[PDB]
Design a protein around this motif. Structure first.
Motif, short mmCIF file in Angstrom:
data_model
loop_
_atom_site.label_atom_id
_atom_site.label_comp_id
_atom_site.label_asym_id
_atom_site.label_seq_id
_atom_site.Cartn_x
_atom_site.Cartn_y
_atom_site.Cartn_z
N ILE B 12 0.84 -1.19 0.00
CA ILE B 12 0.00 0.00 0.00
C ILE B 12 0.88 1.24 0.00
O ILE B 12 1.98 1.24 0.55
CB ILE B 12 -0.96 0.01 1.21
CG1 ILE B 12 -1.86 -1.23 1.15
CG2 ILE B 12 -1.78 1.28 1.21
CD1 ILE B 12 -2.93 -1.28 2.23
N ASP B 13 0.39 2.30 -0.63
CA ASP B 13 1.08 3.58 -0.67
C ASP B 13 0.06 4.70 -0.87
O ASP B 13 -0.67 4.70 -1.87
CB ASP B 13 2.12 3.60 -1.79
CG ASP B 13 2.90 4.89 -1.84
OD1 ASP B 13 2.68 5.77 -0.98
OD2 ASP B 13 3.75 5.04 -2.75
N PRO B 14 -0.04 5.66 0.05
CA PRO B 14 -1.06 6.70 -0.09
C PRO B 14 -0.80 7.57 -1.31
O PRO B 14 0.34 7.72 -1.76
CB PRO B 14 -0.93 7.52 1.20
CG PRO B 14 -0.17 6.66 2.14
CD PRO B 14 0.73 5.83 1.30
N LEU B 15 -1.88 8.13 -1.86
CA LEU B 15 -1.78 9.13 -2.92
C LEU B 15 -1.70 10.50 -2.26
O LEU B 15 -2.69 11.22 -2.11
CB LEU B 15 -2.96 9.02 -3.88
CG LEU B 15 -3.07 7.70 -4.64
CD1 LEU B 15 -4.27 7.72 -5.58
CD2 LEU B 15 -1.79 7.40 -5.41
N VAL B 16 -0.48 10.87 -1.87
CA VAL B 16 -0.28 12.10 -1.13
C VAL B 16 -0.64 13.30 -1.99
O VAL B 16 -0.30 13.38 -3.17
CB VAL B 16 1.18 12.20 -0.64
CG1 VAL B 16 1.53 11.00 0.21
CG2 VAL B 16 2.13 12.31 -1.83
N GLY B 17 -1.34 14.26 -1.38
CA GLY B 17 -1.70 15.48 -2.08
C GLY B 17 -0.74 16.63 -1.80
O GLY B 17 -1.06 17.79 -2.08
N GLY B 20 0.14 19.41 -4.42
CA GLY B 20 -0.81 20.49 -4.61
C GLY B 20 -1.29 21.14 -3.33
O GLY B 20 -2.36 21.76 -3.34
N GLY B 21 -0.54 21.03 -2.23
CA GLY B 21 -1.01 21.56 -0.97
C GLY B 21 -0.68 23.03 -0.81
O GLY B 21 0.38 23.49 -1.24
#
Lengths: 51, 48
Positions: B12-17, B20-21
């Motif tokens: 698993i690997d998050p889709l980090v935002g 665009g933060g």
């Protein structure tokens, strides 16, 4: 005189001493405040800076 | 024996935002400078 000699109801105001406060007494009689505040300015403008 | 081919484990690997933060912003009040001709308190004296 002494502070104790002032009637109580008069102690709720400015009590001048003579001749120590003669200039202050004159200011009081003239109804001119010894310090007059500078005119109030506008609220400062806030600058937003990113980090 | 059985083969894990179909049942293989999952990573698993998050889709980090973060890309665009928005950033944290610091506020500074623009002081009405006394270097500029700002007013002063009118300490009064009496010429008797």
């Amino acid at each position: 005189a002494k502070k104790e000699h002032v009637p109580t109801w008069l102690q709720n105001t400015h009590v001048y001493s003579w001749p120590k406060n003669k200039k202050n007494i004159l200011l009081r009689l003239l109804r001119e405040e010894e310090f007059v505040a500078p005119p109030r300015g506008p609220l400062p403008t806030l600058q937003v800076v990113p980090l | 024996v059985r083969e894990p081919g179909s049942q293989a484990c999952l990573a698993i690997d998050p889709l980090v935002g973060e890309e665009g933060g928005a950033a944290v912003a610091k506020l500074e009040p623009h002081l009405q400078p006394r270097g500029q001709p700002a007013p002063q308190p009118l300490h009064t004296l009496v010429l008797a």
